[PDB]
A paper describes a structure:
Tau amyloid accumulation is a prevalent pathological feature observed in various neurodegenerative diseases such as Alzheimer’s disease (AD), corticobasal degeneration (CBD), globular glial tauopathy (GGT), familial frontotemporal lobar degeneration (FTLD), chronic traumatic encephalopathy (CTE), Pick’s disease (PiD), argyrophilic grain disease (AGD), and progressive supranuclear palsy (PSP), collectively termed tauopathies. In these diseases, Tau amyloid fibrils accumulate intracellularly, leading to an array of pathological outcomes, from prion-like propagation and protein homeostasis disruption to enhanced neuroinflammatory response. Importantly, recent cryo-electron microscopy (cryo-EM) studies have revealed that Tau exhibits unique amyloid fibril structures in the brains of patients across different tauopathies, correlating with specific disease variants. Our research uncovers that the widely used rTg4510 mouse model expressing FTLD-associated human P301L mutant Tau, develops amyloid fibrils whose structure is notably different from those in human brains diagnosed with non-hereditary tauopathies.
After helical reconstruction, we obtained a three dimentional (3D) density map with an overall resolution of 3.3 Å. The fibril comprises a single protofilament with a crossover distance of ~633 Å. The fibril core encompasses residues 274–329 (residue numbering based on the 2N4R Tau), which include the C-terminal lysine of R1, the entire R2 and 24 amino acids of the succeeding R3. Two elongated strip-like densities in the shape of peptide constituents, termed Islands A and B, are also evident. Island A aligns against R3, and connects with densities of R2 proximate to K290; Island B aligns against R3 as well on the other side, connecting with densities proximate to K321. Yet, when overlayed with the five ex vivo 4R Tau fibril structures, including GPT, GGT, AGD, CBD and PSP folds, a part of the P301L Tau (residues 297–311) that displays a U-shape, exhibits a similar structure to them. Instead, the P301L mutation establishes pronounced hydrophobic interactions with L282 and L284, which together with hydrogen bonding between the side chains of residues 286–299, attract the N-terminal segment (residues 274–299) to the U-shaped motif forming in the unique P301L fold.
Numbering used by the authors:
A (entry chain B), B (entry chain A), C (entry chain C): 274 to 329
The structure:
Amino acid sequence: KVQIINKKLDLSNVQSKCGSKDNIKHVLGGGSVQIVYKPVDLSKVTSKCGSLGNIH
Amino acid sequence: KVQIINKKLDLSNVQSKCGSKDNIKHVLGGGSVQIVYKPVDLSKVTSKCGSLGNIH
Amino acid sequence: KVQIINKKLDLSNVQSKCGSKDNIKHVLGGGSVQIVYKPVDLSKVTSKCGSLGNIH
């Protein structure tokens, strides 16, 4: 048995000039909030040159 | 048995000049909020040159 | 047995000049909110040149 009372709460976003990259920004749960954040990442930024040559 | 009462809550977005990339921004759940965030990523940015040559 | 009462809630978007890329922006659930966010990504940005040559 649980009994919760959420009265007069404030979760308010006000922005003027803002660039963002935000995943889970504003979340409100009545009785519970579970968050599982497991991002995998296998990325590559490669550059391959064979026999480069620079001459003045 | 659960008993919840969500009265007078505020989740309000107000923006003026804002660029964003936001996945899960404003979420409100009556009794529970589960979030599973598991993005996979296998990306490539490659560049391959064989026998580059620069001469003045 | 569950008993929830969501009275006078506020989830309001007000924007003036805003560019965005937002996936799950404003979501309200009566009793529960489940979110499974599992985007896969196998992208390529490649460039291949064989025997480049620059001469002044």
